[PDB]
Design a protein around this ligand. Structure first.
Ligand SMILES: O=C(NCC1CC1)N1CCN(C(=O)c2ccc(Cl)c(Cl)c2)CC1
Length: 121
């Protein structure tokens, strides 16, 4: 399975599955700074799933590793901003993360395999 471009549609499909999940709702759009007025005192680089999807569709990811780094930032931001490890929003973030890690692993493996095959000779 040595298609170097296949990761892009596979990531589009996985983002569709995350957007169809209730646990994504706090992460679909940038954190509301009126709701959380100290957010940028804690978080240096905001990230959300609409920004990831727009970056993918603009053709501004070169690899699925770059998309994976941004999605992981969504989760690390939630962990850094949470006042408690028991908080609702953080709790939702950990379920999304396990689902994401479960499905992204084949996308990364297949892409890296395809690039090694391209450089085989
Ligand atoms: O659009 C969907 N299905 C399309 C299929 C043709 C029917 N979805 C998206 C969400 N689904 C998950 O698998 C899921 C489960 C747990 C978590 Cl945490 C997350 Cl993020 C996602 C199933 C329903």
């Amino acid at each position: 399975s040595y298609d170097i471009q296949a990761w892009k549609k596979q990531c589009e499909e996985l983002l569709n599955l995350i957007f169809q999940c209730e646990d994504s709702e706090p992460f679909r759009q940038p954190v509301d700074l009126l709701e959380y007025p100290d957010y940028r005192d804690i978080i240096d680089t905001p990230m959300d799933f609409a920004t990831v999807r727009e970056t993918l569709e603009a053709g501004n990811y070169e690899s699925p590793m770059e998309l994976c780094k941004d999605v992981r930032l969504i989760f690390s931001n939630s962990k850094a901003y949470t006042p408690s490890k028991r908080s609702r929003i953080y709790s939702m973030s950990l379920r999304l993360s396990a689902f994401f890690e479960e499905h992204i692993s084949s996308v990364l493996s297949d892409y890296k395999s395809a690039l090694r095959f391209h450089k085989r000779n």
